[model samples]
Target: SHMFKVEIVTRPANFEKLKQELGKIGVTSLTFSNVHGCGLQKAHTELYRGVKIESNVYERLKIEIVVSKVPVDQVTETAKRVLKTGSPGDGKIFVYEISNTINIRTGEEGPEAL
Candidate 1:
């Protein structure tokens, strides 16, 4: 059995391009949720007296993809190609292993078992 997980976070504007590319890459299954956080860099104009202000940031999008081992690299690669804008502080990607899985409908287990 094989299973993998991918997490991606990038600018909201780049999400459409990423989604379109995912379709081309044969990745139809994924979960995404809205996220808010500040990175290492600070917004120039949004700062106050060098203290660096913080607001409800809306410039980030988080994506999660779960797949078998064979397609794990492919999934990460596709995300990299789409999310990358050749600039500083774009986003991040994480890969990890899943010990077990189950299907709520049929109570399937493991990878193929699911």
Candidate 2:
């Protein structure tokens, strides 16, 4: 089907810039969600009140995109450019081949449905 799904797991704060940069590359569809990153998080103990607690959690954002017209490399490189540094870490990108796309209302499938 010549369709690919790109998933970006990275910092939440860089979302706006990332989206803007992606749009500049002509990507129209983007899906976003909140995610908890494991490796990028710090594992440490903290003392709170009379109890000792571990603060080993952090917030992250997952950006998912399906592309047909755009090249996959462009997307990943663009993401790298934006997320290559910072305390949140460089993050990760995944690319998968999609079987197909379906439009419920119009019954359109494949790339057009994107």
Candidate 3:
């Protein structure tokens, strides 16, 4: 078996639900970060302290997970199922081949490390 990395980027508002869904599928370890970027939809303006600010970026949550036992399609499908709002900013999923991995504390490596 080989290891794979799954990265999902979507609206921050959908973070909790997405996490729960992934948990249900036996994905216990994951990492996420708050991010901002613009895609096909152009950015908008916002008012702060009575000052208009041209905002060209949108808030997004980037979730990353590594798996060797689970099917990658399951992860991507779950994300799409939860994030599909029939809108432009629904976000994207990226899959990458993981060449190696290691657990520092336990000295575990490869798929077992995941």
Candidate 4:
């Protein structure tokens, strides 16, 4: 079986909804982290009214979902629906091919243990 890496970065408020959507799609396990955004068209602001602002402008939540190819589309679509709030600074999604995966507990490879 093949796998993919799905990353979604969105505002903190939407994270709970996204998590529920993931469950609806049968995605039981994931790695999530609190993150800050930068380096894109909507880079985090550092200055305001010609004054120096030290804090970051945007706070983001990053969700990393790794699963087999069969469930890839379902996960991606669920993320899209949950994160769509029709507001600015929503977030971005990215998918990457994963060559291999290992289940440390059972030493299972591929989709069996995923």
Off by over 4 Å in 3: 40-55
**Candidate 3 clash pair list:** none
lDDT of each: 0.74, 0.82, 0.85, 0.80
Report the number of the highest-lDDT candidate: 3
The TM-score measured for candidate 4 stands at 0.79
What TM-score, over all chains together, does every model reach? 0.72, 0.77, 0.81, 0.79
Q: Rank the candidates by lDDT, best first.
A: 3, 2, 4, 1
Candidate 4 lDDT tens digits, 1-114 = 788889988888867777787887778889989988864334345665354334346788888999884488898888878778888777888999888888999998877767
User: Of models 1 and 4, which has the larger lDDT?
Assistant: 4
Task: Give one digit per residue, the lDDT tens place, for model 2 in 22-80.
Answer: 99998987999997865433344464435444445667788899988888899999999
Query: With candidate 1 superimposed using the best TM-score fit, by how many Å does residue 7's alpha carbon deviate from the native?
Result: 0.4
Instruction: List, residue by residue over 14-34, the lDDT tens digit for candidate 1.
Output: 778777887676666678887
Q: After superposing candidate 4 on the true structure, give the runs of residues whose Cα lies further than 4 Å from its correct spot.
A: 39-56
Ranking by TM-score: 3, 4, 2, 1
Q: Which pairs clash (backbone N, Cα, C closer than 3 Å) in model 4?
A: none
Per-residue lDDT tens digits of candidate 3, residues 1-114? 889999988877777888799999989899989988864433444644354434467888898999888789998999899999998788889999999999999899998887
- Against the true structure, candidate 4 has what lDDT? 0.80
